[PDB]
């Protein structure tokens, strides 16, 4: 079906009345399913709204306000799911559809609106509006939202045509014979669950239907209450992950399909991405990024802060800016990649009268702590008082150095009172030189092996006039015993450029937990990685050889094929929508139950499933 998103402007008019009509016409032309909200506002008289007769489903709310057009042909609108609310709990608001002439919305022929899932409706200040007073809303709106209805019908001075005599209790949406209200809920018998087709229990609708049904089966609903897979209304789309007994592991279900609004699709439509919860979304929102898998786009959560490039000193708005001050530091919030330079000069903390800039607050320096990339250089000749290291740059890893200071240096840290550099994550300096001089309390500076960070042939380093190494070594300000001979950025083992043996996370350690330690580990690339929580720690041996439960030496609880699992699969969904149940024998090994044992077993055969 043809699908459109919808609008959310509420009561805001887009330019002139014609401009507002054009944007509304572009959105809902040939639209059958509205993913968002349906907002019909500021539609003047004699405007052709014939394109609204194709709308059948709306997920959010329906807003019809400030319209002077007499007929809004929402003829084929069947369901208002109410996934969003207009004001507080309104899934349908028809408010103030008149003008100074007091001749506004007169004909609202929603003859197929048979159910509203969530939310109430509101009608207020709609003169000359006919027939809507006769509608029995108890048959269409949910029974729990009837407590917040707001119906105001004061139209006794307008010329209205009477309902058709064949309408039940005189309830009609419009004047025509087709406009009689189609009751399909309150007239149902007590035995019909949900809705029905007439008045007998032999023509009830399946509880998965929404508006109505042509037959008793599930494939007979007009629209689905929750999801629609192919031609069948289902409570949930087919599971994407199923436990096949062949591989003893959760694998991708070929019949598994994603969720797109109220439909279940094998693939998301064009220009749509799948999320981590199995749904089709227009674009991966905040706190998540986009990545390709199997040639299909998929959303993934951001590794920490998301990528947000920002212009630095000398680019755009920050050109001719002397230093990062209290005026421009507001533009550096959540920035992780600086596209330019960074000046940290004493004029920020002091301020000047020419640029009309107040002193920079030292606490605001933690704003650019998320910065991980600098395309230009880094000039730091000022730093707050009580900070012993570059705390705001502990998450910087790359300085490109396309632009250089004095035609030479790309990293300038001069005339500071810091103790350590604190650049724990700095791993690459592609181009430019490094100058660190004049910091008479700075140690560790001469230890770093800078040829490891360089990337251009000919890069030099100038690190002098700091704290003497004889004074640093006497006070203990030396690299940790666990650091490699390639230097360090501080005393703690978290500051090593590299570890002399192995590492656990970002901290250097003497050895991995192979035979000792509470969390047993294994070694690869000189780094310690935890074993699976199901590999039982061995005394005379290592605990695991890899990551997953396939590489355990001895399972800690139960065994499911080559895997160590906490419990055997009891109640896991399988193929053909048939649950898979297993049991544990004497050796704590998982084996399948009997095919006829639908609710689990404790032993082989039908013995474990008594009557």
């Amino acid at each position, epitope marked *: 079906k043809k699908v459109c998103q919808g609008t959310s402007n509420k009561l805001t008019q887009l330019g002139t009345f014609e401009d507002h009509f054009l944007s509304l016409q572009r959105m809902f032309n040939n639209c059958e399913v509205v993913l968002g909200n349906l907002e019909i506002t500021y539609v003047q008289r004699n405007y052709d709204l014939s394109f609204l007769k194709t709308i059948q489903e709306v997920a959010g709310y329906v807003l019809i306000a400030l319209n002077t057009v007499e007929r809004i042909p929402l003829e084929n609108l069947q369901i208002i799911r109410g996934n969003m609310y207009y004001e507080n709990s309104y899934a349908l608001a028809v408010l103030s559809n008149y003008d100074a002439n007091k001749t506004g919305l007169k004909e609202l022929p929603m003859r197929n609106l048979q159910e509203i899932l969530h939310g109430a409706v509101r009608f207020s200040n709609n003169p000359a509006l006919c027939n809507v007073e006769s509608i029995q809303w108890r048959d269409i709106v949910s029974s729990d939202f009837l407590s917040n209805m707001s119906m105001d019908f004061q139209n006794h001075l307008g010329s209205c045509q009477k309902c058709d005599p064949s309408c039940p209790n005189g309830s009609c949406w419009g004047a025509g014979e087709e406009n009689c209200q189609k009751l399909t809920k309150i007239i149902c018998a007590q035995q019909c669950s949900g809705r029905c087709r007439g008045k007998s229990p032999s023509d009830c609708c399946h509880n998965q239907c929404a508006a109505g049904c042509t037959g008793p089966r599930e494939s007979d609903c007009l629209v689905c209450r929750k999801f629609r897979d192919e031609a069948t209304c289902k409570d949930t789309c087919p599971p994407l992950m199923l436990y096949n007994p062949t591989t003893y592991q959760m694998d991708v279900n070929p019949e598994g399909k994603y969720s797109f609004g109220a439909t279940c699709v094998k693939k998301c439509p064009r220009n749509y991405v799948v999320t981590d919860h199995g749904s089709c979304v227009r674009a991966c929102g905040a706190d998540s990024y986009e990545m390709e898998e199997d040639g299909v786009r998929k959303c993934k959560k951001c590794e920490g802060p998301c990528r947000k490039v920002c212009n630095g*000193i*000398g680019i755009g708005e920050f050109k*001719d*800016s*002397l230093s990062i001050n209290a005026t421009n530091i507001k533009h550096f919030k959540n920035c992780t990649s600086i596209s330019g*330079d960074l*000046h940290i*000069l*004493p*004029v920020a*903390f*002091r301020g*000047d009268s*020419f*640029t009309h800039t107040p002193p920079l607050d030292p606490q605001e320096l933690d704003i650019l702590k998320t910065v991980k990339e600098i395309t230009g250089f880094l*000039l730091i*000749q*000022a730093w707050p008082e009580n900070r012993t290291d570059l705390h705001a740059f502990e998450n910087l890893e790359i300085i490109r150095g396309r632009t250089k*200071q*004095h*035609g*030479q*240096f790309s990293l*300038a840290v*001069v*005339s*500071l009172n810091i103790t350590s550099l604190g650049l724990r994550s700095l791993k690459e300096i592609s181009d430019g030189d490094v*100058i660190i*001089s*004049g910091n*008479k309390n700075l140690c560790y500076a001469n230890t770093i092996n800078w040829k490891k960070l360089f990337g251009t042939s000919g890069q030099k380093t*100038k690190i*002098i*006039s700091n704290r003497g190494e004889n004074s640093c070594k006497a006070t203990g300000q030396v690299c940790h015993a666990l650091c490699s001979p390639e230097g360090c950025w501080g005393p703690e083992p978290r500051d090593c450029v590299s570890c002399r043996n192995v590492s656990r996370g970002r901290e250097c350690v003497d050895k991995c937990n192979l035979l000792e330690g509470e969390p047993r580990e294994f070694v690869e690339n000189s780094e310690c990685i935890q074993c699976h929580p199901e590999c039982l720690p061995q005394a005379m041996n290592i605990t695991c050889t890899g990551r997953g439960p396939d590489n355990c030496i001895q399972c800690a609880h139960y065994i499911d094929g080559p895997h160590c699992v906490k419990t055997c699969p009891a109640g896991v969904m399988g193929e053909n929508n048939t649950l898979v149940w297993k049991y544990a024998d004497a050796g704590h090994v998982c084996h399948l139950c009997h095919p006829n044992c639908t609710y689990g077993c404790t032993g082989p055969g039908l013995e474990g499933c008594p009557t």
Partner: antibody, heavy 119, light 108 residues
């Protein structure tokens, strides 16, 4: 030959002293250097007057705050110095030198010009 | 502001080592820069950052800064080294820069 000084060598007392420093061989609109004025009376020592960045931010000498106004214009590629209410003690050779930010020392010095105040 | 103290005159034998001092209230925490000004010429940066040497300065020029006195040490003094020497420091917080009184170095 990079930094060139210019201005009237004769100045009467109590009037404004005007001097201009013209930069050549590069661009004064650089983020790597300050621009400073340094003077020394005949037979005395150097005295820093003030520093100017090409954006307009200034730093002055505490002994010459109220009488010194240093500006810079990027189009003409130059920065000037103005000293109001001049006295007999301001007779000096006025140098303009380049002041990088990586060292905060005066890299390149101009040859300076001598302005003498008299009746 | 900050004050720098230099000896007015220092003499040295040809080929020997000359040591020009620069006094300052805890000048060891700051970076000192030395300039050489021959008569009639502009000052020339001979040493920056306490001890470093710009390109174009002979190795004979060495510097040291500790406590409250910085020292400009000329290794093998020649006849052409007779000039005025000024030590210079840049205040970090104040952003001001102060020069010394000068030192007329004379070769015996």
């Amino acid at each position: 030959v990079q930094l060139q000084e210019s201005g009237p060598g004769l100045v009467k007392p109590s009037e404004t002293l005007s001097l201009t420093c013209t930069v050549s061989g590069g661009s004064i609109s650089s983020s790597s250097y300050y621009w400073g004025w340094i003077r020394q009376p005949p037979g005395k020592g150097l005295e820093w007057i003030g520093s100017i960045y090409y954006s307009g931010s200034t730093y002055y000498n505490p002994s010459l705050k109220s009488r010194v106004t240093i500006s810079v214009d990027t189009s003409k590629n130059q920065f000037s110095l103005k000293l109001s209410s001049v006295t007999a003690a301001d007779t000096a050779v006025y140098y303009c030198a380049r002041l990088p930010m990586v060292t905060m020392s005066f890299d390149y010095w101009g040859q300076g010009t001598l302005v003498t105040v008299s009746s | 502001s900050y004050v720098l103290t230099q000896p007015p005159s220092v003499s040295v034998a040809p080929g020997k080592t000359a040591r020009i001092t620069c006094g300052g209230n805890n000048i060891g925490s700051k970076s000192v820069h030395w300039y050489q000004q021959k008569p009639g010429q502009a000052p020339v940066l001979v040493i920056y950052y306490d001890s470093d040497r710009p390109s174009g300065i002979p190795e004979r020029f060495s510097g040291s800064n500790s406590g409250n006195t910085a020292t400009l040490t000329i290794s093998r003094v020649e006849a052409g080294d007779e000039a005025d020497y000024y030590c210079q420091v840049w205040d970090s917080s104040s952003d001001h820069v102060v020069f010394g009184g000068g030192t007329k170095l004379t070769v015996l």
